[PDB]
Amino acid sequence: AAVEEVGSAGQFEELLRLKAKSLLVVHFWAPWAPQCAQMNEVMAELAKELPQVSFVKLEAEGVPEVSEKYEISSVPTFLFFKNSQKIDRLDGAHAPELTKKVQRHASSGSFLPSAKVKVD
Numbered sequence: 702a703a704v705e706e707v708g709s710a711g712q713f714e715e716l717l718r719l720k721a722k723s724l725l726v727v728h729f730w731a732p733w734a735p736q737c738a739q740m741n742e743v744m745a746e747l748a749k750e751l752p753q754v755s756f757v758k759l760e761a762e763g764v765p766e767v768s769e770k771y772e773i774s775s776v777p778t779f780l781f782f783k784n785s786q787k788i789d790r791l792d793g794a795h796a797p798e799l800t801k802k803v804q805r806h807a808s809s810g811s812f813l814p815s816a817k818v819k820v821d
Contacts, residue, residue: 703744703745703748703749703756704728704741704744704745704748704756704757704758705756705757705758706757706758706759706760707757707764708760708764709764710764710766713764716755716757718785721784721785722784723754723755723783724753724754724755724781724782724803724807724808725754725755725757725782725783726744726747726754726757726781726782726803727757727758727779727781728740728741728744728756728757728758728777728779729758729760729761729768729771729773729776729778729779730758730759730760730761730776730777731760731761732760734776736776736777736793736794737776739794739796740777740779740796740799741758743796743799744758747803749816750812750813750816751807751811752811753808753811754811761773761776761778775792775793777791777792777794778790778791778792778793779799781802781803781806783806788806789802789805789806
């Protein structure tokens, strides 16, 4: 859905395995948090610019065993994974910084030189 939702520890474990050879960005989110509404929109734009990268969301309160493992006490928290290892983290709704970390970890050539903007 641009940003697929992971609904259980089992699905998360499988996802990490499936996506081992590429970058995976996980937005730990809450459906009541305006921070996360802002950042889901950012994640959807990233997802279009970087189809090599997997962008998913996981409801922190809905999968609490995963949240506890990864020390998720607030949302948004973004975790970055390659080969089932956490390689980076961002706490809070900081759009430019999310994008900077994604660009740092994404492969060279993963994006075109420009992105279309909506000017209204």
